[PDB]
Design a binder for these strands. Sequence first.
DNA 1: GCTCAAGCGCTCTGCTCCTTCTCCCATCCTCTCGATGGCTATGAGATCAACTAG
RNA 2: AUCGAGAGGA
DNA 3: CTAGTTGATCTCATAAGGAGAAGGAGCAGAGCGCTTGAGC
Lengths: 51, 220
Amino acid sequence: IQRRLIKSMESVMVKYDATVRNSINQVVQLRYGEDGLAGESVEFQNLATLK
Amino acid sequence: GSARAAVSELMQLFPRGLFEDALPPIVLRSQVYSLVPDRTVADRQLKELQEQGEIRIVQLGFDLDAHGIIFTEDYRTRVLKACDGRPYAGAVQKFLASVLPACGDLSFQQDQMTQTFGFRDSEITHLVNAGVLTVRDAGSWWLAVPGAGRFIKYFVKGRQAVLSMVRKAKYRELLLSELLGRRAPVVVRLGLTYHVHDLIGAQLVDCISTTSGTLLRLPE
DNA sequence: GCTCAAGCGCTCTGCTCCTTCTCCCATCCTCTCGATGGCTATGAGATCAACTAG
RNA sequence: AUCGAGAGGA
DNA sequence: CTAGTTGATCTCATAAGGAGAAGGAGCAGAGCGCTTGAGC
């Protein structure tokens, strides 16, 4: 399963126009993670106006 | 009954405008035997009249005895208007000026074509490009007529069609006067008159004469 | 008895079933045990291209 | 040295 | 340019998987040119 996942996604990268494209250059995400942020800088928070 | 006369009539029947003046008008050796009762001699007249250079008999593939006839002059006049403007137009003209008026054989051997006609092994594809050289085998190839594909497809379709309705006919007979009087079926476009000659030569029917004209029957 | 029908066989998908066929099965590391592995001659003719003189 | 097998460690 | 010689070089000689994808079969029905074909 791990090998299949990596061979599926191995060429996907964040481009210099802040878009996520594969080797063929087909866009998959206009903005990485739909927001454009890395995963090691975000943190859990609480939305004060929802509840 | 003259083979010169026999071939002429079939030529007239041909639907010339149906093929947009591209395929030269083919007439079959099967329908040649229809007009001339003695086949034994029909081949003999056409044989010397083949080497006489006024006829081209081309071998076709719808059956083992498939030998078509193309008028020489019309065979000439039509290849240039078809070859010219194409990459293969080069050595096909040579084939015409050299091979056609110097030989009349239905299929050319490898050593024959390469040596007698001085043909290379690269331009030979150009003759295969548009219906000039067919493929008999590794060593020999029958002479081709360009654009013969559509004809035989309609020809075979027509033969089957006429055969079918003849069988369907009540009591399995159908008067010849009842073909001409009745509108030709749309399935066959080569002409109802064209095909009925073909089965007569192919002996799929027999011209049985009676008080009410002549009749055709499946062989018993 | 003159035109809409009724059929009709032939062909064209097509629809599902059954069969067949190729690939695929975590990474890295250590060690031992076994198997493997080929080894006619010697002489005769004959050509040929390079030295070694002429 | 090559192949194959077996026994193992995380 | 010619012979003679020396190696190469050759030739011939005697003896208790699976999931899925791809092909083909067979039947099943729709459609249509056709061939009648017979009721008003």
